[PDB]
Symmetry: C3
């Protein structure tokens, strides 16, 4: 998979970035088998105030996780995975769960090339 992680600049220390990457990676690994290859977590930082909810400028604690997945997993499994991401990122990023949005996009596995794939 690739997890694009949208966070405000400097909210995550180097240690926290590692912790959040671990939380997401371990979540994915925990809910998949040996078919799993490698999870990428790609942090995308922007200055605080670049997020608006209902038109209202936010203070910088929001995290949006956009997970790019292969097709085929059940709704129940994806639900468990999103839940685990919310729970574990909440701890790693030191934020209330309400600050976390998680969206999954699915693609045919054939058009997902990793580290020189298929």
């Amino acid at each position: 998979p690739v997890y694009m992680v949208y966070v405000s600049q400097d909210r995550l220390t180097p240690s926290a970035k590692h912790a959040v990457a671990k939380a997401i990676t371990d979540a994915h690994r925990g809910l998949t088998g040996t078919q799993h290859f490698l999870a990428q977590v790609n942090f995308q930082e922007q200055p605080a105030g670049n997020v608006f909810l209902g038109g209202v400028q936010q203070g910088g604690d929001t995290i949006f996780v956009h997970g790019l997945h292969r097709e085929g997993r059940s709704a129940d499994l994806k639900g468990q995975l999103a839940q685990r991401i919310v729970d574990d990122v909440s701890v790693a990023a030191e934020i209330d769960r309400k600050h976390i949005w998680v969206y999954f996009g699915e693609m045919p596995a054939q058009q997902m090339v990793e580290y020189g794939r298929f």
Copy 2:
């Protein structure tokens, strides 16, 4: 929904960022009912010159709006929504309509978690 908004650094003043977020949010709200919960607009700024069209470096006025939506809306409705976004962002960002690209991606609602959802 989540609207990722790709703009060049400093093109939008704080007031313009609010205006563009309002334009997008109001567009979505105007074409949905009470099932609508909350629209996120997430600005992603990069230095001018990071956009290439047909291999040609652009001057910084381009805006790409990547809207992440639930599945199920009609082609006609999505068309109206994209059109309204182009029209209203053109005004808010003080740019010619030609500078605006709008793409919508759709996901099963179940794998869209907002502010601690489903």
Copy 3:
């Protein structure tokens, strides 16, 4: 199409950015016909160390190309396109092929508005 290109800050010189944009644009053009309109390549730079693979912080050479496409192309064609992108970006960005990830997302053409489309 829109190609979002996630790279580490300063890895690509202005000339290299042009070269990578050319590589991606020419790849798309080479595998499409006159129905093709215009390819956008949109560079998204972040400080080196914002990419984690299997929880391990990377040194900054990774490039993730997220291609946003219309629906309808064959698996074989998409495979050729991803392969060409990997090969040609490897040269343009002066990196080993292993550093390149390429994912394609597909949308109904009707909800892809370019430069004031449909």
